[PDB]
């Protein structure tokens, strides 16, 4: 799927 | 699926 | 928070 | 937060 990564 | 990762 | 919307 | 929208 589409990836959001908020580190 | 679609990935949300909020570290 | 951070928003992911996969319509 | 940061916004991803995948229509």
Other Cβ atoms less than 10 A from the Cβ of C2: the count is: 13
Question: D7 vs chain A: nearest CA distance in angstroms?
Answer: 11
Resolution (A): 2.0
- Residue D2 phi/psi, 5° resolution? -85, 145
Q: Which residues of B touch C3 (CB under 8 A)?
A: none
First to last CA, chain B: 19
Q: Which two tokens stand for residue D5?
A: 């929208």
Interface contact flag, B2 A7, Cβ < 8 Å:
no
Distance (Å, rounded) from C-alpha C2 to C-alpha B3?
12
> Could you give the C-alpha distances from B7 to A4, B1, B4, D1, D7, in angstroms and in order?
11, 19, 10, 13, 25
Distance (Å, rounded) from C-alpha D3 to C-alpha C2?
6
- Nearest C-alpha neighbor of B3 from the set C4, A7, D7: C4
Residue A7 CB contacts under 8 Å (≥ 6 apart), including other chains: B5, B7
């Amino acid at each position: 799927g589409n990836n959001q990564q908020n580190y």
